[PDB]
Amino acid sequence: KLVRLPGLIDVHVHLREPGGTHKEDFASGTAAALAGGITMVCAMPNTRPPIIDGPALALAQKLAEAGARCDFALFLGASSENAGTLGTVAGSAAGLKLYLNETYSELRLDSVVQWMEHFETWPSHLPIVAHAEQQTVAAVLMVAQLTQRSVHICHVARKEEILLIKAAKARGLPVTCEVAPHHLFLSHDDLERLGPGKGEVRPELGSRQDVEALWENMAVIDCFASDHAPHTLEEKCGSRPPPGFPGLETMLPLLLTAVSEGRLSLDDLLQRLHHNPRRIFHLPPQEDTYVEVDLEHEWTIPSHMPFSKAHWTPFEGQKVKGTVRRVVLRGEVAYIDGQVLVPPGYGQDVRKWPQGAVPQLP
Amino acid sequence: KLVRLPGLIDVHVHLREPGGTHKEDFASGTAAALAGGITMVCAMPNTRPPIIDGPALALAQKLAEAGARCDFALFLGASSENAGTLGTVAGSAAGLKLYLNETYSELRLDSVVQWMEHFETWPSHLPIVAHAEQQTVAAVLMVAQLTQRSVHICHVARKEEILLIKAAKARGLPVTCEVAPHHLFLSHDDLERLGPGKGEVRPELGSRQDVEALWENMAVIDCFASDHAPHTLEEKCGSRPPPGFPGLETMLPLLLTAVSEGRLSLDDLLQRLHHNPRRIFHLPPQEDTYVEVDLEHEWTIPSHMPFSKAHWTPFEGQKVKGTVRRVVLRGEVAYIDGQVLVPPGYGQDVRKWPQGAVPQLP
Ligand SMILES: NC(=O)N[C@@H](CC(=O)O)C(=O)O
Ligand SMILES: NC(=O)N[C@@H](CC(=O)O)C(=O)O
Ligand SMILES: [Zn+2]
Ligand SMILES: [Zn+2]
Ligand SMILES: [Zn+2]
Ligand SMILES: [Zn+2]
Ligand SMILES: [Zn+2]
Ligand SMILES: [Zn+2]
Ligand SMILES: [Zn+2]
Ligand SMILES: [Zn+2]
């Protein structure tokens, strides 16, 4: 007896195209998404070239339209030079991404004044998401208040961060956040097994107390999002390991295991992988789209999942209960039992759908 | 220049059919909904007979399918005799409604133990909404905690209530709530003009301090819902006035006025009339459905709106800015400039759509 879920949405993926296609491309990363029960992804802008201007966005849109197998929206990235220049294309993007700490990106902003300039110039009705760790969460929240608008905090990983966000919500501030599966299901206790290269990720893996604080504060978490950040094993095991984990294929099985164990409900999961992504990012419904999962099947995560070109996973060896059996996307069978059955280019840019534009005052 | 909105959802309407059809019926109340920019309604069970058992629900479903002009879901009502009997039909309903205070209903429960029995027997994945005023909000929240599930509080009207809910959310408790327009736009200051009959409503109109507390605590309000509660002028002005106001045709114009004045944003409005209703009640998307509004048109609310059979309104004389120009429902023009253009029976029970069933574990 399968369970039918709506089309799930991952608001934080790195699909590496253009410029890092040995790590992943639109076709492989969206195959991974479909196999993970994800029918819509929002792709981050830290590509090569980065998606920081209109020509780069135009290129990325065409590469995604030609390669994506599921539907998508593309983020724009904030840079030290593009505030005030994105107004014509802003509404065609998922939102604006700010990189406020060291990570796999060349887009770090060097002054809080640059953050303010982005918050002041980006259209006020459109999403802003921030990579903001530890005190940076408080700092970007201050900038959001000074500019009288909302912000969404990416990949929250620490007790410190979730409690700060909790305090902000208690004061009625317009802040939302997401948590990635590695920060719910891995911790410092796993660094022995992973090693220092594979274990590299931003935010870094937390303590057991960090993990327990995220679970205890599930009510504060608006979304789950994978932060699918594929890099090859050679890169992760080499001299200058880039941070990041692949995660599209493992996110839903990990979370279904937690549902089966009573750690959160099916509804809690669907709020965080469907309804809240829709409402925060104004992402449209997908007609005739659903995911069928088998909640009884027990399996062990292998050394690599079938689709991501990362060809490794930090969850290797974990026992899960729950698997994706079938995905239907817009009336077509997109995935069955290990086979993706829609070609590259089946996926569409949801921001071009009439129902996918963000509503605004004239 | 019109603004396109998605199909708005009102999770709290009284359509009076069966048994009170001089006040409203499915055809007239859903005409009123469409003229108010509402494309989906959830109808309350305090009809005659009340929707408290499977035969009554079956009758109401057929009357709604034959009369509704917009889409709908029907609540079941909790009674002193039906706990443990609704399991076969529960998933076909919008949710379960509990009447916990005196109001226009014969369904009051006489003991908190009866509330517990409903929370224990109603399927745990399906919505429960409560009419719960003042301390009753705290009482039903306790019952929800004892039974380890969520609750949604109808028509919050008082500083006391919104602050209690705020405190509960700060403790991470699974509670949501809605506020009706009369509790945002009318107060004791209006009882002089309304008189004691017309002014009768449950919860009663609040003080200016109550109104100001609801606005100040907008972040705590998950949904707006009209509590459209039509009664004729003869009834409202007679010896034993029933409580309630009609409100479908005035809700969106009142709230658009507030948006135009900067009291809340367009997004704040759409979270509360679209996204949060969807996610709390698991209501499906409506394909090819949207509402076009004109935000510049200033008008004065007349002594009665065109469609509701209530034929009166407590908002008479208020100046508003914002009007519904066109509604498209599932690919058909449903309303233009004062004319409803879909017939009775165009509307459908969304709980029968594949995408409208509430997901559950097997
Ligand atoms: N999280 C990571 O460790 N890496 C991400 C970048 C990011 O989300 O910051 C990547 O693009 O590789
Ligand atoms: N609110 C009211 O004053 N009346 C409502 C009942 C209700 O919502 O309690 C009605 O059905 O007339
Ligand atoms: Zn990041
Ligand atoms: Zn993110
Ligand atoms: Zn990332
Ligand atoms: Zn939206
Ligand atoms: Zn009520
Ligand atoms: Zn209600
Ligand atoms: Zn009511
Ligand atoms: Zn749902």
Short mmCIF file of N, CA and C and ligand atoms in Angstrom, two decimals, chain A residues 274-275, chain B residues 278 282 359, ligand 10:
data_model
loop_
_atom_site.label_atom_id
_atom_site.label_comp_id
_atom_site.label_asym_id
_atom_site.label_seq_id
_atom_site.Cartn_x
_atom_site.Cartn_y
_atom_site.Cartn_z
N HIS A 274 6.51 21.07 0.93
CA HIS A 274 5.51 21.38 -0.08
C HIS A 274 4.84 22.72 0.21
N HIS A 275 4.06 22.80 1.28
CA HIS A 275 3.24 23.99 1.48
C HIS A 275 4.06 25.23 1.79
N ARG B 278 -4.88 26.79 2.42
CA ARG B 278 -4.52 25.56 1.72
C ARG B 278 -3.81 24.60 2.65
N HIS B 282 -5.43 21.38 4.02
CA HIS B 282 -5.06 20.47 2.93
C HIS B 282 -6.02 20.61 1.76
N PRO B 359 -3.46 13.70 3.00
CA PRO B 359 -2.55 12.56 3.03
C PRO B 359 -2.54 11.90 4.41
ZN ZN C 10 -1.65 19.50 1.85
#
